[PDB]
Design an enzyme around this catalytic site. Sequence first.
Site, short mmCIF file in Angstrom:
data_model
loop_
_atom_site.label_atom_id
_atom_site.label_comp_id
_atom_site.label_asym_id
_atom_site.label_seq_id
_atom_site.Cartn_x
_atom_site.Cartn_y
_atom_site.Cartn_z
N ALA A 61 38.95 22.58 53.47
CA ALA A 61 37.96 23.63 53.61
C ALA A 61 36.95 23.12 54.46
CB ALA A 61 37.69 23.53 52.16
N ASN A 146 38.27 28.64 48.80
CA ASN A 146 37.30 27.94 48.44
C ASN A 146 35.88 29.00 48.06
OD1 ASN A 146 34.78 26.36 48.44
ND2 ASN A 146 36.81 24.61 48.68
N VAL A 178 31.71 23.17 43.55
CA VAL A 178 30.21 22.44 42.39
C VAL A 178 29.94 21.19 43.79
CG1 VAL A 178 30.79 24.18 40.76
CG2 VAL A 178 31.37 21.89 41.33
N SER A 179 30.10 21.05 45.16
CA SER A 179 29.34 20.07 45.59
C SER A 179 28.69 20.04 47.04
CB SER A 179 30.56 18.57 45.11
OG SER A 179 31.87 19.73 45.82
N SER A 180 28.59 21.46 47.08
CA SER A 180 27.44 21.60 48.50
C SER A 180 27.00 20.83 48.74
CB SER A 180 27.78 23.02 49.08
OG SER A 180 27.70 22.79 49.94
#
Length: 354
Positions: A61, A146, A178-180
């Site tokens: 992504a 995503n 949930v990890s940007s």
Amino acid sequence: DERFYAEHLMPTLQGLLDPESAHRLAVRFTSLGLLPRFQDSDMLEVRVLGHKFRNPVGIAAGFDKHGEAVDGLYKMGFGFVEIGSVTPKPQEGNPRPRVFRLPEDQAVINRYGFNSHGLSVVEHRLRARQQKQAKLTEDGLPLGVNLGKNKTSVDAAEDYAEGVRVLGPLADYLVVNVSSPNLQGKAELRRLLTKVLQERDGLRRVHRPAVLVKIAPDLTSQDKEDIASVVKELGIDGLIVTNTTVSRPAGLQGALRSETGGLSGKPLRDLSTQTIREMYALTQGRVPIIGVGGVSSGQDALEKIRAGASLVQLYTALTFWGPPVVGKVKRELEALLKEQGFGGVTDAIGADHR
Ligand SMILES: Cc1cc2nc3c(=O)[nH]c(=O)nc-3n(C[C@H](O)[C@H](O)[C@H](O)COP(=O)(O)O)c2cc1C
Ligand SMILES: Cc1c(-c2ccc(-c3ccccc3)cc2)nc2cnccc2c1C(=O)O
Ligand SMILES: O=C(O)c1cc(=O)[nH]c(=O)[nH]1
């Protein structure tokens, strides 16, 4: 041909273009099918949860955020494509420049900030090729989507639910991102994934995707334990391990190493591989893992597979090697599987835990 891209065409484009501009052009070229030309080893086929994947190398992504070049990405040789992140309402992201090249480190730092065309536009793009994708998935080329939240967003869980409803029908797997680099506790993540999984289960059977979480490499040991607990408790379908890192390892040499953003590429490789290893042990090899981070060779892929990944994604290696990288990783992965006495990719998943 692979030598030509790595040594001449790719360095030239980088010399002439700002990275975000070069990203845009790449997407355009891929959208039009202006690509170079390895195929079809049976060793490389893998059946994750029942869905069959023709090879285990996918495009991570972030490269095709808005679903504009999905078909050209299959044409590049990828075994699966993942698009996104998509946010519900459109948003412009962060001001430019927001993508930075670290060539001495074979790395990138980015702070795009979830620039997204939005769910409606991506939905129509995916609807324009929905039946084409159906036949592709049947022949071993699945598609993942995503999902992100908007920045001004109030209920974060509501944003992911909209994504599940609007885009879940078009996807083989969904990713809750949930990890940007640009959440509070275990009970909060349980509340979010329970809502997501409930919306998913309300879609009709042929439109009911798998649901995976994508996690950061910067988690504490307690966070990884908590994710593993909730993932097994709620029956989440898989993990994508890992996103980019907000850490800045020592010995990074690029001048732009102190830009805020997520670091991708080689300096993430082994930190990413160790998180796979960790998440695979915490879930008893019971949860499929797509490993992604710093992969640019057969050995990079096999280390992640042996660590517990059933599939691998790459992105940054494409910005240095060009589209020939996909063939290269596949060709090498098959050679080393043989060398090391594996029947196929499936024989090697988790092989490091014996
Ligand atoms: C420019 C850029 C944009 C990205 N955008 C996203 C994104 O929107 N959503 C996401 O889940 N990951 C995003 N990623 C992370 C990649 O999916 C991948 O996890 C990360 O780059 C590590 O892989 P790599 O070292 O092979 O590039 C992005 C990465 C880069 C470099
Ligand atoms: C060179 C490049 C590329 C890139 C450029 C060209 C191609 C290509 C595609 C099809 C045919 C021939 C070339 C692929 C990727 N992408 C990027 C994507 N995201 C961030 C940065 C980059 C950069 C970069 O400036 O570091
Ligand atoms: O800014 C983004 O869009 C983004 C970057 C990144 O590295 N990871 C991610 O999930 N989003």
